C-alpha cells in the first residue's frame, strides 16, 4: 500500500465518478478528502495541503482552472491532476502553463477504465515518493536495466517470515537469470494473505519494470475488489485482467508469466490462478499439477477462472523458463 500517510483531495461534482476515485485511492492506502466543487475545494485547502488534488475543469461555482491559478498565484506547489471532458485547447495550454501532473481526458461512458490511465500516470511519483538522487528515480530505472534488476533483487522477500498468523517460507531452486522468478507475499488482513509469482525473463527489461510496478500496486488492486463484496471472496482472474490492462497502459509490452494465490487462515481456502506458469501443489489431500502456457501481455482479456482447494498446510513448486521456486505455508 504505497500511499499510506498521504492525503488526496478529490474534487468531483458527479457522485458516480467521485465514489470511483475515492475507492481507488483509499485502496492504495491514502486518506481521501472529498469536495463537491471548486469553492468547496478551495475552502478545504484552507486547512491542509494534500499530496495530490484531482479535479475537473468544468464544475459548479468555481472552475478547475481558476482554482489552479488561485493556488499557484498564492505560492502552493500542491501536485494537481486534472481529469477533464474539455474540448478547448486553451484550457489544456493554461493548465500546463500553471503546472500540473497531467491533464487526462474523460470518455463518454465507462469511467471504470480510467483507473489504469490514472495509476499509470501517477506511478512515477509513487516510486519517487520512496526515494526520500536523480540517479535513482523511476526514469533512471527505465533507462538503466542493470540498476532496475538489482533493485528488484534487493526487494525480494526474506526466505522465512510470519504473515497473518501463517509461517511462509520459500526458496529459489534454479538460477536461470539475474532476477528470474520473482515473488511477493502480502497480508490483506490479520486473517488472509495473497501472493504472486512473476517470471521476469520473458519480456527482459520490461519484465523487471513490470515487477517493480506490480509490487507497488498489487495489494491495492485486491483491496479494491474485496471492498465491494460482503464476503471476502477474491476473484483472482479479475485481478489478472486488470494487471494486463495496467501493464498495457503503462507501456510495458511483452510476455509476463504470472501466478496469483490467496489464502485465508481461518477458512482454510487456497485459491490459485496461473497465466503462463506451471505449479505443483502438494497437500495432505492430493497432489495437484496446474499448467497454463499463455502469459499476460499476449491476450486482450487476461481473465481466467481460478482453482480453490481447502487445506491446512501446503507447498507449491512454481516454475517457468525463468526458473523454479518452492513456496510453503503452515499454521503459525
Amino acid at each position: 500500500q504505497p500511499l499510506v500517510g498521504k492525503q488526496i483531495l478529490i474534487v468531483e461534482d458527479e457522485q458516480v465518478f467521485r465514489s470511483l476515485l475515492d475507492s481507488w485511492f483509499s485502496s492504495l492506502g491514502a486518506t481521501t478528502v472529498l469536495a463537491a466543487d471548486g469553492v468547496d475545494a478551495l475552502e478545504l485547502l484552507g486547512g491542509f495541503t494534500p499530496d495530490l488534488m484531482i479535479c475537473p475543469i468544468a464544475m459548479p461555482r468555481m472552475n478547475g482552472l481558476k482554482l489552479l491559478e488561485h493556488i499557484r498565484n498564492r505560492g502552493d506547489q500542491t501536485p494537481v491532476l486534472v481529469i477533464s471532458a474539455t474540448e478547448n485547447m486553451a484550457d489544456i495550454a493554461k493548465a500546463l502553463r500553471l503546472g500540473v501532473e497531467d491533464v487526462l481526458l474523460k470518455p463518454v461512458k465507462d469511467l471504470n477504465r480510467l483507473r489504469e490511465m490514472v495509476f499509470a500516470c501517477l506511478y512515477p511519483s509513487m516510486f519517487n515518493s520512496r526515494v526520500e538522487r536523480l540517479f535513482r528515480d523511476w526514469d533512471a530505472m527505465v533507462d538503466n536495466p542493470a540498476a532496475a534488476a538489482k533493485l528488484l533483487q534487493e526487494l525480494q522477500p526474506p526466505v522465512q517470515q510470519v504473515i497473518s498468523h501463517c509461517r511462509v517460507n520459500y526458496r529459489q531452486l534454479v538460477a536461470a537469470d539475474k532476477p528470474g522468478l520473482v515473488l511477493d507475499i502480502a497480508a490483506l488482513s490479520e486473517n488472509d494473505l495473497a501472493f504472486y509469482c512473476l517470471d521476469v525473463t520473458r519480456a527482459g527489461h520490461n519484465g523487471v519494470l513490470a515487477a517493480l510496478l506490480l509490487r507497488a500496486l498489487f495489494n491495492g488492486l485486491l483491496q479494491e475488489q474485496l471492498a465491494h463484496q460482503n464476503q471476502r471472496l477474491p476473484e483472482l482472474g479479475a485481478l489478472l485482467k486488470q494487471v494486463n490492462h495496467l501493464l498495457r497502459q503503462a507501456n510495458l509490452p511483452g510476455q509476463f508469466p504470472l501466478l496469483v494465490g490467496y489464502y485465508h487462515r481461518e477458512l482454510k481456502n487456497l485459491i490459485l490462478v496461473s497465466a503462463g506458469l506451471n505449479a505443483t501443489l502438494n497437500t495432505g489431500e492430493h497432489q495437484v499439477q496446474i499448467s497454463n502456457g499463455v502469459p499476460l501481455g499476449t491476450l486482450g482479456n487476461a481473465y481466467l477462472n481460478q482453482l480453490s482447494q481447502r487445506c491446512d498446510a501446503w507447498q507449491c513448486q512454481i516454475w517457468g523458463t525463468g526458473g523454479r521456486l518452492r513456496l510453503m505455508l503452515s499454521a503459525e
Binding site: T86, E87, N88, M89, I92, A93, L96, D102, V103, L104, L105, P107, V108, R113, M117, R248, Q249, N251, P253, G297, T298, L299, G300
Partner: protein, 106 residues
C-alpha cells in the same frame, strides 16, 4: 493480412469520421491550435500521451502503441503511430498528416 488491413481502416475512420469516439480535442483541436500558436514541447508531449491513451482505449486489438510527432512536416501536424497488435509478431507503422480538413494516410 486481413487483420492489419482492418485495424488500419478503422484507425483512419477514428481520425476522420465527424462523430468519432476519439475526443475532438485530439482530432481537430491540436491541429487547429498549432496553426495559431507557437509550438511547445510540453503541449506536444501532452498530445502524444493522451492520443496514445485514447487509441488504446478505443482499439482493443492494439497491444503496444507509441505516438510521436514527425518533425519534417513543419507546415502542419504529422503523427507517427508505431503499433503492435495482439497475435501478430510484426510491428505496424501508420503515418498520418493533417491537411485540408482531416487526416490522411501517408
Amino acid at each position: 493480412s486481413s487483420l492489419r488491413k482492418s485495424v488500419c481502416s478503422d484507425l483512419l475512420t477514428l481520425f476522420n469520421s465527424p462523430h468519432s469516439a476519439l475526443p475532438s480535442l485530439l482530432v481537430s483541436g491540436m491541429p487547429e491550435w498549432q496553426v495559431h500558436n507557437p509550438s511547445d514541447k510540453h503541449l506536444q508531449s501532452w498530445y502524444c500521451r493522451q492520443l496514445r491513451s485514447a487509441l488504446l482505449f478505443h482499439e482493443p486489438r492494439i497491444a503496444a502503441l507509441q505516438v510521436n510527432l514527425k518533425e519534417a512536416y513543419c507546415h502542419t501536424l504529422a503523427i507517427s503511430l508505431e503499433i503492435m497488435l495482439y497475435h501478430d509478431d510484426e510491428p505496424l507503422t501508420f503515418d498520418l498528416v493533417w491537411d485540408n480538413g482531416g487526416w490522411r494516410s501517408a
